[PDB]
Every structure is written in C-alpha cells, then in structure tokens.
C-alpha cells in the first residue's frame, strides 16, 4: 500500500539526468526505513558514492552514513514540498538517525535541479 515506492522508483531514473553530481557533492549512502501505521513496510537505500548513484530496495548493502524514518504518508508530504524536513524532524513525524547534516545536504542539493542538470551535461 505505499505510495513512496513510485519515488524511489522514479528516482532511479532521476539520477540518469542528476546522478554524477549529485555524487560528486554528497558522496554518502542513506537509508530509509518507510512506516505503514506505526510498522516498517519498506526499506530503500540511496548510494551516492560512486557513479552516478544507486537506488535498491532493502537495507544499505554497506553501512549507511545516515538513516531516514517517517510514515509513507509523510514521506509524500515531503517529496511533495508540503512538509518542510525539519519541521517533520522537531514535530517527531520525521526521525533521522546518523550524520543529519548529510541528509539535509541531499536537500539543498536535490532542490537546486537546475545545475546539476547541466553540469551532467557532456556537449
Ligand atoms: C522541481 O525541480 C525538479 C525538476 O524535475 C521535476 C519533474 O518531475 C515533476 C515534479 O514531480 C516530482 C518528481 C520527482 C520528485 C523527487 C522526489 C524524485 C525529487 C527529484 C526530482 C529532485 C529527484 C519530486 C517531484
Ligand atoms: C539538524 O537538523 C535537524 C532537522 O533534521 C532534519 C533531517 O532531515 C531528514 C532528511 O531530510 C531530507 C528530506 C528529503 C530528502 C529528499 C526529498 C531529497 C529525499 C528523496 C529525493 C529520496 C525523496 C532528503 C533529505
Ligand atoms: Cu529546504
């Protein structure tokens, strides 16, 4: 029943257009533990550390820098630009367990679409 599963998925295909650069200013791996009532119901990990990233289902093959957990329909209220990170992170609905500065990164990075676009550009 989860919704977020089409944003990792669609994520996947994201970082063809976003991955190297994204790589290159993050260079982290992290984990996300979606909830279903108050019960895990998927688990999903984004590699940034080489390439142009990595996008599977199940806990990081490796150690994570940091892990993300949040109900599903929370983690569409944040895609969704509707929920701010860290007012979900002080609220309690949000729980991020690691390096948060990394995660916050993965943020601002991700927001600026603009020029990483354009630097993965090889002309
Ligand atoms: C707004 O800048 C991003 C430009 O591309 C967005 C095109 O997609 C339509 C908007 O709907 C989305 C799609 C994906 C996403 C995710 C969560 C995957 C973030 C992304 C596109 C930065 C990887 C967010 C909104
Ligand atoms: C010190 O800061 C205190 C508040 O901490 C907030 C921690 O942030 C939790 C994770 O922040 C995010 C939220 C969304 C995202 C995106 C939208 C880029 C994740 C995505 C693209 C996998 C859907 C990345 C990081
Ligand atoms: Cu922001």
Not at 31 to 44: D, L, M, Q, S, V
Not at 106 to 118: F, Q
Request: proline share 2%; glycine share 10%.
């Amino acid at each position: 029943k989860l919704q977020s599963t089409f944003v990792f998925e669609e994520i996947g295909r994201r970082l063809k257009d976003i991955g190297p650069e994204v790589v290159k200013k993050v260079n982290a791996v992290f984990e996300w533990h979606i909830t279903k009532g108050g019960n895990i119901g998927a688990k999903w990990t984004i590699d940034l550390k080489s390439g142009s990233g990595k996008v599977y289902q199940g806990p990081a093959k490796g150690a994570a820098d940091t892990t993300i957990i949040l109900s599903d329909e929370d983690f569409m209220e944040v895609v969704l630009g509707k929920l701010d990170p860290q007012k979900a992170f002080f609220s309690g609905r949000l729980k991020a367990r690691g390096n948060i500065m990394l995660s916050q990164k993965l943020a601002m990075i991700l927001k600026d679409y603009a020029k990483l676009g354009s630097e993965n550009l090889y002309f």
